Symmetry: D3
Subunit: 280 residues, 6 copies
């Protein structure tokens, strides 16, 4: 009762277009979560983004399709949640590798907390020199990790440890326009990452590593939305993040995220690709 019909009509007459400039060609919510998705535990931006992460993991599991009793290699495994879900859902063994000591200890704490230390094995190891014998894994994935490594070496190592006829799922960025030097330096100073290759350049490395390309699917909008969620979280929580990671790290993000966002929007693409080590 605190507003009248005339006041609401005037509000939309004056400001209604602010919804079209921010939300699109309608004046209502986006369906950001599919109808079948469960209600999150809370509406915090990190919790909702976490559920979109798990649905992303489920889709990768579905795309690669690991079979029960197989052994998968998580190349650049993070803190292990991707491995935990694949193991739980498919009844597989998973081995993960990362060059971060804290990440691997957290992944081992994860497997210990769920009672899966037998099927989950997390070791500090470099993907450009894997400590595993040839043809050890039925399949493997590199989920947003190749950008930190030399792609030709890591792809060769993945080819070596795969059994012939197995598949490697990659989640990799690619440039569509040539980057300026400020943009290439943002890749290192923001994420400790390398600049992505061209699409043809990437598939020459894939082919030169001995792989066949079975599929590619663009997931660029998901990266753009994810990058927006990251940007909003850093802006709204600068004080919290400065007290944790330091003023120099946070201020680097606040000053760089805007530029890197526009570079991502205009010059790069992000895709999921299935790579097969041929049989015979």
């Amino acid at each position: 009762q605190q507003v009248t019909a005339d006041e609401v009509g005037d509000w939309y007459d004056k400001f209604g277009e602010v919804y079209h400039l921010t939300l699109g060609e309608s004046v209502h919510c986006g369906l950001w979560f599919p109808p079948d998705a469960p209600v999150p535990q809370d509406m915090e931006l990190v919790t909702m983004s976490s559920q979109a992460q798990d649905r992303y993991t489920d889709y990768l599991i579905e795309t690669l399709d690991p079979k029960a009793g197989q052994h998968l290699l998580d190349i650049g495994c993070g803190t292990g949640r991707t491995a935990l879900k694949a193991a739980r859902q498919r009844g597989i063994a998973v081995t993960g590798v990362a060059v971060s000591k804290e990440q691997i200890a957290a992944a081992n704490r994860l497997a210990a907390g769920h009672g899966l230390t037998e099927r989950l094995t997390f070791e500090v190891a470099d993907a450009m020199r894997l400590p595993y014998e040839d043809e050890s894994f039925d399949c493997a994935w590199a989920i947003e990790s190749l950008c930190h490594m030399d792609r030709a070496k890591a792809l060769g190592e993945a080819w070596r440890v795969l059994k012939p006829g197995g598949d490697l799922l990659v989640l990799e960025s690619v440039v569509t326009e040539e980057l300026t030097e400020p943009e290439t330096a943002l890749f290192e100073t923001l994420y400790a990452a390398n600049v992505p290759p061209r699409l043809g350049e990437f598939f020459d490395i894939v082919s030169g590593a001995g792989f066949h390309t079975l599929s590619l699917k663009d997931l660029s909008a998901n990266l753009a939305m994810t990058m927006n969620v990251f940007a909003l979280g850093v802006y709204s929580r600068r004080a919290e993040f400065t007290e944790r990671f330091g003023a120099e790290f946070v201020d680097g993000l606040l000053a760089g995220l805007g530029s890197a966002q526009e570079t991502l929007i205009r010059k790069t693409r992000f895709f999921m690709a299935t790579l097969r080590k041929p049989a015979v």
Copy 2:
């Protein structure tokens, strides 16, 4: 080639790998914000991607209400008409949309003429709390994020009156789970030109008091929390553009109130899609 080494990368995640966990969730990868069968957008602008999520949202509402070809739907609080346009093309129905903004109704008429659907799309400035239409004129209706501007009892009783017996009204409404402080109630008027949402039982007493049966309810709170996150980020990152467009008083009010409004939304409100039936016979 190769701007970093494995050791530099390993140190980076030891020190900063948690700012991904603090913002993106329990993993360190992207979210599946767009379903795999969705088309790749024309652009990666935040407004372009949100617009596509708006249309899939609209497709879900059309799917839920399920209007049949040759029916007439009343769009209560129709905005600028894109929801009505999509329903008309996909299902072969007529739509009549009402809104209290002369500007919005004008844009919806341009939309219908630009698409050649002026016969099946009618848009009119009119109040949902006093609809000019006759009794039992429409087969179905929806009020998509518009009851919050209204006296819900009047609007629901009026929607009931113009629905034929047996027809359904699709409602997308907010509700409070707490009590709301007085500053929180004022932000609804000063930011959104809206009334405070009612309590759940209070809301469905109003639904029952208007003569509706409740056939379904589905929580969509996450979609509203994400949408408000997309709105806030657009306002924060484009303050200069919006002040030159709408004036500093309007934009500064948003920059000052969006934070508290988001927390109140997250911790005190819930947002759902409900299907109400006007009983038959």
Copy 3:
């Protein structure tokens, strides 16, 4: 070979409308079972109805979606089949409570029969005074049992034994009219159950207990068909049920089911609702 075209035509001229008064706007069978359903073992009414009960249970399992390893509380568990199928399909532990000694015994013999006594516990314990500690179960459901209890005390007690962030599945009736006194009495004399509240009154009790409401779906026609199945079996098997339960009980049903069915059709609705205990 037995009738002529003229005889058949005169038959539908005289009586064709008995199919429309009873079966609907067509003159053919209803699709009462989905095409992907198995051909039952018998065509007996209780057999067909039982398969519909299992498909009903499958839909609840799919709706509540219990995850493997969780512990579920069955409020008003009956003879335990619902708990058994949920435990078999999802790999969960179930604890069911009921005020009937004969049911709880049949439920324990059902768990022993299927070798699941380690994961199926059935006890005689009141829903309005549950004996379990706080935050004991990850999820729960009350499948057509709140109508016997005080709905404020059971819900508040289910909220108490639930872990924060857990889901409670409720299958409850609700009045749309006011109910006359002979209608309210039929609830106790036929079903030994209270009268259902109003929808707004129900969700005040749901909110007053501390629950959020995540979903509601109408299932009124399922309850209407089930009640018709029940009545048709009572009318056609009067001599057996009188010999089984006594003539007083059977005659009570034969005299009230017709009126109870009209009250159900005209004055009540039946829904499935997903209530949540908020997280921390």
Copy 4:
């Protein structure tokens, strides 16, 4: 209101009446799929009508007529099946029945939906169709062949069908052999012939020149539909005697029980697809 003790003692004595009538659980059956709409009302005839329509939707899906084809409805009844097929697939339908009442009711359906040029209903004999050879792209006989001489009707349908078109048939068959009272109950209740055996029926289909492409048992649907019909006739004996006479209704009340057991134990009901072969 009731107490917990009163409820528990109630189920201790009468809890098993639910297991004798509803099945191995104590809750509703899922008689309507979750995606189906809420009916306009919970009257038995209104619910059964929705099951009839979903049945019709399934036949359309099974036969799969193409937009621009012409379907022949052998035994069209009051025409709703033809109407739903015409609106959903954009086809012309022609329906024949030996009842003047039914064709008048079907003609009002044709005009009432602004079709008339695509919906045609005539009084004709299926055993002597008036149409020319190779007239229809497809046809169906939905529960109508039991009133006919099957070889004559099937040969006639084969004549009017274009080469390569399909005939959907919804027919019953005996698995026992039927006593003479059971055979007579067929004529006196529903002016129809006794069903043939399975092999006998397909010998008749063979001799007419069809190829059998599919068969699917729908016996449980017929069983439930007959229970719905019996509950309606029984619970509404006064209204039906006043509209159809006492002799007709008394004949149903005395024969529906024996017809139902004979249906359950000695008959089966299916949907079959019959192809008139294309040109060699």
Copy 5:
């Protein structure tokens, strides 16, 4: 760049129609594998047909739907792969019978190499005189094996060893025409098989064995395509097959396969049928 537009245009002007005579009404690939099928390990004709065989098996498992803990009888089990896939997918036990000592040895070999000798039993036995007790198996299938047997005997024996209420999935051919004597001889001289019965004759046998017919689905195009796959491999590998099987057996195939394909196309149909042993 080694061809020009005029040369490509002339080529299709002269030779374009050879694609329409061999491939169909278009000039592009056939969708022989569903888009969700995995990319095969290699593109050898035998490998691709093997993937098609496995998807065929997955369909029979879905159709028969054996439940975890049941015992399935494979009547004419070949070298075991179908049994192995059913045991792995449905957690069942399989007993296979064949009249070839080599195939049973290969099936026991296959069971040992997969560690499933406790759940897979393969034996040399005659389907027309099975050595198993009555009501020993919950379900069974005869996958393209009845053609070698006296169908009434095999079906009667299959009914005997089935528990009541269990199902038997049959993959059988049937003649739609009458076969000339040279055609009937090719059934013996090529495949050591009997001539298929008619459709009514087959179901007279099925009913005589005591089976109800629950479903039937045509699969004639699959068999027809499989035979084309078989003939092409024989033609294109005449020297290999003569060296391994002798010139007499290969010359018989090379002289009869063409006529066999024509008789198959014009005179027979191949279907999948579900047969139920009635419960009591």
Copy 6:
């Protein structure tokens, strides 16, 4: 007619012929999905045409043309893919090919179905399209790029598309370098160029200005089509020699086997969706 022992001895001696030809089982392959309709004939060209039609349905679903749009069929053949797309999506389709017999047969097809206002077929070269810039909403090149210069065709498709339009490509690629006789077979048998490498093909795509949105391997479909084709020629040599002369048929009979092996071991076939970026 046969006894149990006769059948057992038969499989003891010859059962392995089924494993060498059909796979690791002794039964039929599910070549048609269960929901597919029973064909009119069991003739090979019949069943293969249904497989071609289901192929077209998949391409329609993948490109997803919307009603009212205008589609360019690059290398349209005799036009059945265009016909089905127009009837199913209510679109206009313009199709070009360098064959006069094919374009004539496509206009006949369009005329016979009463879709001459929505189906336009012209004789033209895809490497020099006669249409204006930004004239089509979408486009596809269904197994036609192997006849052309892929750089010229792709650059010319990019020119005629509107910004934001999508081009569906069905193209082959070598995974190993071909010998000189293998390269020669592409011209003698099919009048086609040798496929490029995967990375080489996508430098051409990026060079024409396209973003790559998807890729899906379809190599088994091509190998099966090439087997269905070869079996058609082998089994109907006398017919095709009367139809196309002995010189044409003898070449196919002498080259299909080698061509099949090169296909199996050195090439892959895929469907790819390329977008002309929006502004």
